[PDB]
Amino acid sequence: SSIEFARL
Amino acid sequence: GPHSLRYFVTAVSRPGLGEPRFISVGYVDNTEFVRFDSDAENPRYEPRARWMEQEGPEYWERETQKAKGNEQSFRVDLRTLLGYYNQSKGGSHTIQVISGCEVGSDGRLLRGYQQYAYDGCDYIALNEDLKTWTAADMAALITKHKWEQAGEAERLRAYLEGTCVEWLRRYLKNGNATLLRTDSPKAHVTHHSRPEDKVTLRCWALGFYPADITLTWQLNGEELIQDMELVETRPAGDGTFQKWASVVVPLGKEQYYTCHVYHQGLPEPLTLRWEPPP
Amino acid sequence: IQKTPQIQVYSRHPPENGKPNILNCYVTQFHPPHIEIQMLKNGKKIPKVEMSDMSFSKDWSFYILAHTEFTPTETDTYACRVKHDSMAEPKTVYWDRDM
Numbered sequence A: 001s002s003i004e005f006a007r008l
Numbered sequence B: 001g002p003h004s005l006r007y008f009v010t011a012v013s014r015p016g017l018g019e020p021r022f023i024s025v026g027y028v029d030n031t032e033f034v035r036f037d038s039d040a041e042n043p044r045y046e047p048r049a050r051w052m053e054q055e056g057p058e059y060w061e062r063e064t065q066k067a068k069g070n071e072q073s074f075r076v077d078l079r080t081l082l083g084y085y086n087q088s089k090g091g092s093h094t095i096q097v098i099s100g101c102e103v104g105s106d107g108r109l110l111r112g113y114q115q116y117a118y119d120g121c122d123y124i125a126l127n128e129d130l131k132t133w134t135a136a137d138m139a140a141l142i143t144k145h146k147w148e149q150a151g152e153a154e155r156l157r158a159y160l161e162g163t164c165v166e167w168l169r170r171y172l173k174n175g176n177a178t179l180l181r182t183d184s185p186k187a188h189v190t191h192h193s194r195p196e197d198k199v200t201l202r203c204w205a206l207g208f209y210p211a212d213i214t215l216t217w218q219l220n221g222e223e224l225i226q227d228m229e230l231v232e233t234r235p236a237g238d239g240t241f242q243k244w245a246s247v248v249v250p251l252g253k254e255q256y257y258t259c260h261v262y263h264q265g266l267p268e269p270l271t272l273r274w275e276p277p278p
Numbered sequence C: 001i002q003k004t005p006q007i008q009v010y011s012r013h014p015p016e017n018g019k020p021n022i023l024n025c026y027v028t029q030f031h032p033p034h035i036e037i038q039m040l041k042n043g044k045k046i047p048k049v050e051m052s053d054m055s056f057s058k059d060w061s062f063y064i065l066a067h068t069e070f071t072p073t074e075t076d077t078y079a080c081r082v083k084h085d086s087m088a089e090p091k092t093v094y095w096d097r098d099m
Helices: B050-054 B057-084 B138-149 B152-179
Strands: B003-012 B021-028 B031-037 B094-103 B109-118 B121-126 B133-135 B186-192 B198-208 B214-219 B221-224 B228-230 B241-250 B257-262 B270-272 C006-011 C021-030 C036-041 C062-070 C078-083 C091-094
Touching: B003 B057, B003 B152, B021 B057, B021 B152, B031 B050, B031 B057, B031 B152, B050 B152, B057 B094, B057 B138, B094 B152, B109 B152, B121 B138, B133 B138, B138 B152, B186 B257, B186 B270, B198 B214, B198 B257, B214 B228, B214 B241, B241 B257, C006 C078, C006 C091, C021 C036, C021 C078, C036 C062
Parallel strands: none
Antiparallel strands: B003 B021, B003 B094, B021 B031, B094 B109, B109 B121, B121 B133, B186 B198, B198 B241, B214 B221, B214 B257, B228 B241, B257 B270, C006 C021, C021 C062, C036 C078, C078 C091
16 A cells, blocks of 8 residues: 655 | 565656656565556556455555545646756656565564655655655755655654555465565576687576576686676566576686576575586 | 666577567666667567566666567577667667577
8 A cells, every 4th residue: 555645 | 584565656747748657566575566557548556466356446446546646746746846946847857756664574664665766866765764854955955844844754654664564464465375486597508609719608597586696607616706797687578587697718618617596496506517418 | 867778688588490489678777767669670670569567676767678579580680779868879789699
C-alpha cells in the first residue's frame, strides 16, 4: 500500500 | 532475512503534447508486484505478480484512487518546481520518488525511504532518523521548511513504521512461495580467437535468479581482476539473468585458467575450465 | 543533467544458426526517460519489436528491454539503434554472437 504524497 | 516494500514513482511533463505521464511501480523484495500507468482511458493499479490477484476489488479501488491522487499532486509539483527554478513552461521535466520500508527478520524497520529527484538529481530525502530532511539545493530548502512546519516527517514515520511494514507482511504471506524462487546459474566457457598468439576465454553464467552473482577468473592461484572483461548482469527476458567474464590468455595455456561462479543459490561455488568439444 | 544510455545487444539463448531465438536490446543508465529504440536487420528497421515497460533504478536512471524474435544465420547482421537527448546522434550497437 503506497502513501499519499505531500506537495513540494 | 530482510524484506522490503517500495514504490518507485515518476511524473514527466510533456508541454504541448498532453498531461504529464505518471507511472507508479510497487516492489516487494525488489520484485515488481503492482503498476499504475496514467497512459490509459481509465488508468488503474494492476497486479504484476499472480499472487496479487488475491486482493479484492476494494483494495484495487483504494490504491487506484490514491495513485490518481498522487498523479494530480505530481502534476502540481511539476508546475511548482518550474517556479522554484525559474524555468520555462515549454520544456519537459521529471520528478521521481522512491518511497518505502526495508524490514529485518525480526519485523522491525531497518530503514525507511522517502527520497525525491528532479530531472535526475537528488532533490530532498528523509534522513535515517526519520525526523529530519536533507535538501540537495536551494529549491529543496523551500520544500524542507514547508515540510518541517507541517510535521511531514512524523506523518511519513507513521506510514513507514506502521502501514508499510504491515502491508509488507501481508504481501509476503501471499507471494512468499513465489518470491523465494531461486534458479542457480548454469555455466560454461567459450573459446574465441583471431589469427594471433592469444585467445579469449569467456565464462558464461545463464538462467540464474536473483540477479546478484559473482564471476572470477583464476590462474592456478590469484584472482585475475586487473585484466578481466565483465559485462553488466542482464535479463534474458524470461525472468532469469545472464552474465559473463572473459580473459585474454596465451595460446595453449587455456588449461591453466579457471572460472569461478558465486551465487546465493549455489550449495558450493562452481569451478570450470575451457573444455574443447570432442 | 542528462545520462548517456548504456547498451547491450544479445540473444536470450545461445545462438544456433537456423534455430528460433530472441534478440534483446537492453538499454540502461539513461535520463531523461524519453528514448527511441529500433532494432535493425542488415541495415533495415525491424517492424515487430516489443518493448518492456520502463523502470528506473536507485540512482534515478531509467532502463528498458527491447526484444524481437529472430532466427540467426551465419551472415545476417543485427543491431540496436538508440536515439536519446544525451547523444548528438543515434548510437548503433551491433550484435556479436560471442557476447
